Design a protein around this ligand. Structure first.
Ligand SMILES: Nc1nccc(N(Cc2ccccc2)c2ccccc2-c2cccc(-c3cnc(N4CCNCC4)nc3)c2)n1
Ligand SMILES: Nc1nccc(N(Cc2ccccc2)c2ccccc2-c2cccc(-c3cnc(N4CCNCC4)nc3)c2)n1
Lengths: 141, 145
């Protein structure tokens, strides 16, 4: 009847950084310090997504990450929940572009007041222009 | 209180992808047993299913490197392995003066009718190319909808 849920999205203007905005947070969940703040204990369904693009390809090796992290009330420690890593640049270019999305999602026990980050190593290579399909969200079960 | 489960790779085990529930941020609730490396469904229903793996490689030895990931189901009554989800990735079009590492994740998933006592199985062909360097890089769970 009041099952916690949240879904947020990126900020296209924010000069090289993944700021989560214009926010659909319901039934307790908050967005504080760019971090989904849980409102109660239980079983939750946690996902996210981010998108990349680079013109050409630089020879110094390009390595793109994404990571959802739990900061538990139990230990105040930044535990990795979901994470991925990508190698767009294998060959240098001609100078033609490339695009690469990353998405994560799992079911997770969470506790009253656990904070959840969602971050990336290289905000400079974001592709904000793709109708803003760079999101983050959670859902109680 | 619906059956669910989320299990991650054991970082100890080398030449295999062993799933673990008894870890930080992993679980099995309401009858989703883990046995013979397989998730096991307590009762019949619509289930969300998903899995992720990640293949690091330290340079391209050759072009013919070929990575797979697959989630399959083995119903009791029928008994054969029915593939559900599937991926093939050849991450080396040409061998790389220096190595220059290459990563390659594979996320799979969908929503699937399951019978009681079905045995889901998320597997790969090259666990030598796995990456446990950081946590949360390799998992496999279900949720009853
Ligand atoms: N990350 C992601 N985003 C959107 C949805 C989503 N869900 C579904 C959900 C979401 C809310 C309430 C209920 C079901 C999951 C949530 C938790 C755990 C697991 C999944 C989950 C399962 C199976 C498949 C996927 C999935 C998603 N996105 C792709 N992308 C789309 C773009 N184009 C390339 C393919 N592919 C597969 C995701 N997860
Ligand atoms: N990219 C994306 N990725 C995941 C979900 C998602 N959407 C859908 C969407 C897609 C395109 C454009 C607009 C809306 C939503 C996005 C934001 C907020 C909400 C939804 C959203 C919509 C419709 C249904 C649901 C939904 C999920 N899960 C359950 N169940 C309840 C019973 N327990 C098991 C879970 N029920 C409903 C969720 N979009």
């Amino acid at each position: 009847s009041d099952k916690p849920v949240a879904h947020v999205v990126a900020n296209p203007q924010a000069e090289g950084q993944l700021q989560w905005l214009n926010a659909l947070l319901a039934n307790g969940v908050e967005l504080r310090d760019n971090q989904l703040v849980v409102p109660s204990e239980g079983l939750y369904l946690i996902y996210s997504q981010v998108l990349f693009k680079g013109q050409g390809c630089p020879s110094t090796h390009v390595l793109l990450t994404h990571t959802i992290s739990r900061i538990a009330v139990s230990y105040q420690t930044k535990v990795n929940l979901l994470s991925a890593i990508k190698s767009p640049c294998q060959r240098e270019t001609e100078a033609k572009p490339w695009y690469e999305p990353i998405y994560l999602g799992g079911v997770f026990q969470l506790e009253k007041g656990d904070r959840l980050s969602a971050e990336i190593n290289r905000p400079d290579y974001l592709d904000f222009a793709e109708s803003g399909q760079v999101y983050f969200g959670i859902i109680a079960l």
